[PDB]
Amino acid sequence: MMLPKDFQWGFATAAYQIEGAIDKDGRGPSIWDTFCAIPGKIADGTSGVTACDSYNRTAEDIALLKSLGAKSYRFSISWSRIIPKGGRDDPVNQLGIDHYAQFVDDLLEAGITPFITLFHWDLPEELHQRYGGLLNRTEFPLDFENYARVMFKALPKVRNWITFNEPLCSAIPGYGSGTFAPGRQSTTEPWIVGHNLLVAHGRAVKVYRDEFKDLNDGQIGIVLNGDFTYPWDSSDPLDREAAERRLEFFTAWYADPIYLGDYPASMRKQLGDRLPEFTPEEKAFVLGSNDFYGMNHYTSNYIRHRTSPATADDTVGNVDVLFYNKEGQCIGPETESSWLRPCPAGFRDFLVWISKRYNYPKIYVTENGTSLKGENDLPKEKILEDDFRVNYYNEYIRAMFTAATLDGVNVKGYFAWSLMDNFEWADGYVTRFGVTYVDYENGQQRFPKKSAKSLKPLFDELIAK
């Protein structure tokens, strides 16, 4: 009937995705600086050299958040601004620390609680050259643990911390399909990388709980994405099992080692020895390493089982990922992202699925939003009238409302992706996710869309006091 007054809502951005200023104040190159220089890797042949220039427009971004009623804000820290070479024995740059510290002060003064992501895919390039970057089971968790501590220490006025954003994207697109940085294609390394990101997460959560959490009663967790599933043929039990296994390969991959203590049985049966075994030390780091559940969600798909055994390059659990069930019923209309079809029911079904499997944890929806098909080619007048994105936020947030208020899903926050149009990775600047239109051709000016002014009066209806 009503959301409690302690429910938060704001917007979400990512450092390399908006900041720009890639060489400014001694910022070291990330693996995405390197990746974008490879021709054909970004659809529009662009990079994050300028993006939204948000690094230099701190006062503007906070005024926009305030003017939209956002009392919370999720952003990420560019590691290579803090430690340009990344390693624990590498010199700390004070200029990026001072930058983000001044940003947090400028946020709190406007009354906006920050929610900070430590690792949003932009690993320092040097760590990748020095020892293999994410592939190193020994070095990277040590270097990330130190980097996390440097931030926990630098920003004591922050209580809401995030280790990794969507570790699945750093493993399969980064080491399996090669669509994301560093750009490798292996049948084995995406499973080693995911293991390394788990251990790195557990090490940082231990350091934070032991020394920095009780100072101001904060919290830290990992952010896992995940789209829901429905049987392609509801009458075929193989498609119901295929729907569950698909979710296990997407999300239980990282969540089962955190809440239950080991990888999903279904992945172990299929991957065998390519899926690593947690050492006792590694298991003590990862098991129970979430103060909260950081949840990204976007869509749902129909899942059809497969009759032949899985190939070596399979990453999704040997299933077909479709937009129509056997009877021809569609998930939803197309967006600019080929993988995103709106399905508000899958947002609530996912929240409930997380709850039942992990004993109803504290959930923060850290990303939710949509792209719009052809939006990048529309005239500015049509872009601001984004009824497709307005409708996308009303049905989903009201679905979240039902899961929280009726099912009892312990969800305590929601963050709309994104605050503004930005650099959608391999899609470039063609794919626009923001509730604020950004005109890249004319000084990266901001123009709030009909979706931006839409979320305050919606949450005012759903949250009490």
Added chain:
Amino acid sequence: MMLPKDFQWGFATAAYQIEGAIDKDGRGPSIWDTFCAIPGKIADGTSGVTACDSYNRTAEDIALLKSLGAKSYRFSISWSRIIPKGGRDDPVNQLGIDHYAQFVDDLLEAGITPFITLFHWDLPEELHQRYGGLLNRTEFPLDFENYARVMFKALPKVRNWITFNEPLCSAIPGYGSGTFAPGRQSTTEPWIVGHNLLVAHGRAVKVYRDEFKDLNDGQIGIVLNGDFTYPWDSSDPLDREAAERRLEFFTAWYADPIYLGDYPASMRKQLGDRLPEFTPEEKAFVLGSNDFYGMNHYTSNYIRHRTSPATADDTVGNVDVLFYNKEGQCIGPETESSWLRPCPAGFRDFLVWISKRYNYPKIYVTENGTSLKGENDLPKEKILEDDFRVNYYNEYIRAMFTAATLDGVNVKGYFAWSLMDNFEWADGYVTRFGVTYVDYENGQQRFPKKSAKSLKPLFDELIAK
């Protein structure tokens, strides 16, 4: 997208609540004729003596149905019209047979497929006096099986058959609380009656499958009511088990023995002696006796576990059936029915719950609808503007649409309760469930409400052409 074109939708009524003419053409009295005469059992001291006079308004109710776009119609045969004393060796009233035989011809002539309920709570009074009615595990299942064969032979044009409407209401309200006919109160008889009603269901199914089903490709099953549940406090695992346990005592009471072979374990644990066991001959009747799942659904509740062990007079499963949860969230707004709060998500929830527990059976929603608080005191013009009921159906039906097109729930029909305001049992006529207003004081005149005209344009949107 679109439901299949073979999806049925219509309206549902029941013999004693609409027919009247309780002694015309040789109708013996049922247990509800005896029940309404006892002072204090009926809220307004009424009976079904006249009801809607539908027994003498055949073509007119068929005209109302054809006018509202209904291609199907669910209705029940009065047992005591066919066999006034109910028994297998008792005389058969041909006038009752001819009455319902001509009604089927008129419905099929009007292009309306019938969906006939054999037993809608009107046990012939003579059976109750002869051997204890539903309490008799030997005599009653034999008299019901013969009464079913009579109607199978009498109505060969019928394909859609229903044994019992809501056996739980015959069991507990009629033998535990005394709120329904025959108005007894026992800690043991409800569980005996439910067993007898299950065996009474199997014998007729076997007779039908073996001697009447194959000629016109018919189907037969039982209709179970079930209101869905949500944990009162989702952080207490005892409240999630309690919400599941409540569904077991309420619906899996009858559905588990039909699909799985025996009563739920939780009911065995609480009841022990009082929960009978299926004999070798009984189990051959009950297990597998559903061509389709007949489902009645109305509302949902928050469920809180209990600290004390269950007392002998418990029927719900040792839980608290609430309208609010611990956090203060409400299910929905009040109706004239104290037990009914609109909750559309629970309809889809119960559909998927039936499907996951019973291998996704074919489902026919045989009753769904709502009453309106204060509707009986409103003026005539205010009654016809029943947007509350209009909104109820629109949400529940679209919730079902999502269930069928996304989750893949194999629901092939939907009947709205009710076609007209009628005798709502212990509530009298004050509780109005119809989409058609009935002026009882002015010759039971029909006046369709805004809801009656709402269904056709909606199903025209959701059913393929």
